[PDB]
Design a protein that fits this description.
Chains A, B: One of its GO terms (molecular function) is DNA binding. Chains A, B: This is C protein. Chains A, B: It comes from Peduovirus P2. Two copies of one chain form a homodimer. Chain A contains five helices and no strands. Chain A is globular. Chain A has helices at residues 4-14, 19-26, 30-38, 45-53, 61-66. Chain A has 84 residues and is mainly alpha-helical. The longest helix of chain A is centred in the first third of the chain and has 11 residues, at 4-14. Chain A has a single domain, classed as lambda repressor-like DNA-binding domains (434 Repressor (Amino-terminal Domain), Orthogonal Bundle), CATH 1.10.260.40. At the A-B interface, helix 4 and helix 5 of A face helix 4 and helix 5 of B. The complex binds sodium ion (2 copies). The site of one sodium ion (NA) has 4 residues of chain A, from loops.
């Protein structure tokens, strides 16, 4: 069981991305991403959509929003979450 | 393409739920849902998670967040969206 902030970090690390790489990919400012990863700010849904639409995060969508997976369709949990 | 507000309306109407019924199932107050549907307010990600975790909206998760579907795993667009 993970919070939004723990989930964003789990997705980013499992993709071996630095925060700066994630900022450059998503267009979310580094400082804002830092706030999201620390739990200081909760991402508005439109920003969250931008993050999950980043090509390598899309496979985490179901897990991220609903804590369910569907690997036959590519929907998985980040490796580092140790989901299941 | 549909905005967040439009997508919420599409999911609810496709599930033939009144707004009050959606309030009662999701536990999101009617006022808040009203503002989400009009665009007056944008849902925080935690609330959007709660909405998509409501059993009959889970199937729209991929479509809602990423504009993609995976029907083989039950991930579809709301019928009224006329997706594809
Ligand atoms: Na890297
Ligand atoms: Na109804």
């Amino acid at each position: 069981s993970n919070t939004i902030s723990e989930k964003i970090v789990l997705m980013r690390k499992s993709e071996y991305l630095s925060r700066q790489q994630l900022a450059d990919l998503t267009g979310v400012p580094y400082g804002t991403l830092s706030y999201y990863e620390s739990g200081r700010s909760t991402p508005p849904t439109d920003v969250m959509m931008n993050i999950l639409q980043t090509p390598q995060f899309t496979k985490y969508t179901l897990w991220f929003m609903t804590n369910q997976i569907a690997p036959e369709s590519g929907q998985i949990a980040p490796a580092l979450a140790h989901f299941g």
